[PDB]
């Protein structure tokens, strides 16, 4: 389908980015395999909504 990862900018915490483009930690999580806020600026973290 189609992929949108994104670099951790300002907003470098889990809860803030999430709700920031819109994306549930749920969800986000799922395809990052990421337990917990463990992020930072520069971090690659897919994001991608839609299916």
């Given at each position: 389908g189609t992929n949108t990862y994104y670099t951790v900018k300002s907003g470098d915490t889990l809860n803030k980015i999430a709700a920031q483009y819109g994306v549930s930690v749920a969800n986000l999580r799922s395809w990052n395999g990421?337990?917990?806020?463990?992020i930072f600026v520069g971090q690659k973290l897919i994001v991608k909504k839609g299916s």
């Open positions: 990421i337990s917990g806020d463990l």
